[PDB]
Amino acid sequence: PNDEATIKALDNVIKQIEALSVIVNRSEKADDAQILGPNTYKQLLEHLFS
Amino acid sequence: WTGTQNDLVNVSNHHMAYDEYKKRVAELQRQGKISIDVNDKHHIVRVFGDDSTFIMTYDEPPSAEEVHLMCATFV
Amino acid sequence: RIMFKKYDYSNFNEKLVLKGEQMTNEPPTLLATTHYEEMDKKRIDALIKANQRAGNILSQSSIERCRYTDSLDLV
Amino acid sequence: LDRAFLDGVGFTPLAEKQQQLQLQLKTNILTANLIRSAINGMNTESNLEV
């Protein structure tokens, strides 16, 4: 039973390490970076009067 | 010598087809389609009599429609 | 999906060892997605040709049921 | 007074301790390591009194 309960921990410690090369090497790794885009200021509300 | 002849002929025209498929792929790359950075490194051809197979490896895996475009170009 | 160790395509003597599984929803990107209609029409014509000489086996049932074969899963 | 006030006890069950001992003491099974054998026969029926 201890072996049956530790094989899951071993499976985690091996797959979550050596199989992450599969996802890591997949294209579009994390997100866009180093590249910026156009934008504009956002108007507020004033409601002036005289 | 039937098997030897069949595998010699099958492995011969495969090289001549790959030679011109490379040209067509290079043409598509200079225009906007398959895109750059999709270049194979090792290609292996395996022949068993009449039947044959072709395996090409890549560093960055092309997206789904890229595979269709290149397979259509090769065929 | 069934996961294997990296295989070196170059050495013919290379062997494969199994390593684990992973569940994935991505359909296989084979061909015939471009020519789906060209094959659907072809098979439906073959079936109706068989049925016309046959004993009128309600072609509507055949056309409705043949589309069930590709709605399966590998589980 | 201690008996009346100390109602429960807090401890970790044996299974986790055996798993940790197995992981820390990476040894092949079927080698008759008495350190692992001795602990395998323990229990905590009597922990409140102790």
End-to-end Cα, chain D, rounded Å: 15
Between CA B23 and CA B73 the distance in angstroms is 10
3-state secondary structure of C4: strand
Q: After which residues is chain B broken (C to N over 2.5 A)?
A: none
Q: Judge whether C20 and C5 are in contact, CB under 8 Å.
A: no
Going through chain B in order, the beta strands assigned E by DSSP cover 40-48, 51-58
As a whole number of angstroms, the distance between CA C42 and CA C48 comes to 10
Residue of A nearest to B60 (CA): A27
Best of B68, B70, B73, B75 to disrupt the C interface (most C CBs within 10 Å) is B68
Q: Yes or no: say if D40 and D25 are a contact pair by the CB < 8 Å rule.
A: no
* Tokens found for residue B69: 């475009």
CA neighbor of B3 nearest in space, from B51, B39, B45, B72: B51
C3 interfacial to chain A (CB closer than 8 Å): yes
State the resolution, in angstroms: 3.7
Whether B58 and chain A come into contact, CB under 8 Å, resolves to: no
Q: Tokens in use for A20?
A: 């992450």
- Dihedral angle of Cα C9, C12, C18, C22, to the nearest 10 degrees: 20
- Between β-strands B51-58 and C18-21, what pairing exists: parallel, antiparallel or unpaired? unpaired
Identify the DSSP state of C26: P
Q: How many CB atoms lie within 10 A of CB A39?
A: 6
Residue the block writes with tokens 């997605």: C33
> Is C19 in a helix, a strand, or coil?
strand
Read off the DSSP letter of residue B1.
-
The CA distance from B49 to B9, in Å, is 9
Instruction: Specify the DSSP class assigned to residue B51.
Output: E
DSSP A44: -
Technique that determined the structure:
cryo-EM
Find, among C34, C52, D35, the residue nearest to B65 by Cα: C34
